[PDB]
Amino acid sequence: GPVPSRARVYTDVNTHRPREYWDYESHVVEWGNQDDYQLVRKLGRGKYSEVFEAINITNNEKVVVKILKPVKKKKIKREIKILENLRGGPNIITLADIVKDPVSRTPALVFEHVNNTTLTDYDIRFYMYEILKALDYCHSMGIMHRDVKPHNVMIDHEHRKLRLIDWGLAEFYHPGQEYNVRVASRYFKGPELLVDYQMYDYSLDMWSLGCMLASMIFRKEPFFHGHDNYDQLVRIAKVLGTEDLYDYIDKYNIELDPRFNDILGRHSRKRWERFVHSENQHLVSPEALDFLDKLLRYDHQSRLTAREAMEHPYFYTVVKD
Template sequence: GTNIITLLAVVKDPVSRTPALIFEHVNNTDFKQLYQTLTDYEIRYYLFELLKALDYCHSMGIMHRDVKPHNVMIDHENRKLRLIDWGLAEFYHPGQEYNVRVASRYFKGPELLVDYQMYDYSLDMWSLGCMLASMIFRKEPFFHGHDNYDQLVRIAKVLGTEELYAYLDKYNIDLDPRFHDILQRHSRKRWERFVHSDNQHLVSPEALDFLDKLLRYDHVDRLTAREAMAHPYFLPIVNGQMNPNN
């Protein structure tokens, strides 16, 4: 599939019988170094490439469930991106309850943190939103929780507690009693609050609009991968790929 790591072979150790998967090689640059150097255009370019992979796997009925920088290999010299580590991936069946112990803490959607099991592909779109926020605001990770409970608190400090309770009510979700002491009350913050002199060159009205349509409590409100690719944020990329001579 597009921008999905290619499995070349499976070999077995003759003695231990341990199987090993052999994948294509990607000359990856560590994201902690790379993300600090990316331009506005490059961020748009790589997120568009990542969306191609997500749109492909979602269209095949698969949720990745562990989208994060460590699982996005980027060969910057060749402008090549590959989505790797399909160990947590799962087929989506409407109405099925899934394990919430997936994804990595900083990229876990609210549905995982409140133990809502009927999630779907939109979980990956939350994780993508976390990556977008960390890239344009130069804040890695964007939601920096110390544990899974604190992770929801960090999200609520940005998206608001009233909005959180409205989401919980809609799905009849009972919050773990442990949250009552730590959640407190927080108003929704404007995305502009995270813009400062070091990151303003990466932020635009369309970037904030795109981010706002990904980082939503309610998974049904998030853009799909296909919808995301049609967002104005990617117009420079789409125009560039249609007219490669630009």
């Protein structure tokens, strides 16, 4: 069957931690009282959560309350544990409290308040660097986000702040573990997910990040538009080319679902110049394209790490200032 894989970095960080750190099923959640919060207004609905601005009436602080839709208790424990483990890290959303409604018994996460919110080449580089700080941090702490995408990035330009949010899909990396491929939004799914390669790692997040970068510098949202998980990889293959795809499939001895043999065909690797146009050219640089090229690889092992990405020339100006 498939050839195994291990993270190039942060491989064993969880093995070296106490079990309690990663064994979130055993975490006991103490719920506070929702009636210490009064909801003010709805901020937006998500797949498994609806978010409100609220007030803590004990001390009149503005906070954000994320009411969880029905999801298995294991997954609520997982998100809480991850948020607690990451709390205080660079650009990580800060979990303030965990509450349950006294009637409905529906659980809610309470966060620190941030505003949600014409982008300059510099701005994109800056905010991408800020995302990379959060990803390097969470990866270094043994956690994959698994859902990096614009909806999960809060940006307050006034204060030039960035928070990575919605850790509901995040999971701990353990070398050798086979994960669920049925995660992430379609447009941001890595090739590993699409070919059903389960022994994936932090590198998934780097693909998703590359997808984001492509969408912004090229003004094409989504960049890889798909009509079905199958067609999603077809769209990727039409850009990255089929030679490298089949090389990856061979290397890991991956078996490609029937619904893929007569749909991928044969495609050249397309040069990034083909996406550049007069109304995005101000966002596109040799540096940007070199960086993007080094994120968007089929082979998860060959993608830049977060820390490597931060050292790329695209970010030299940001690092300076």
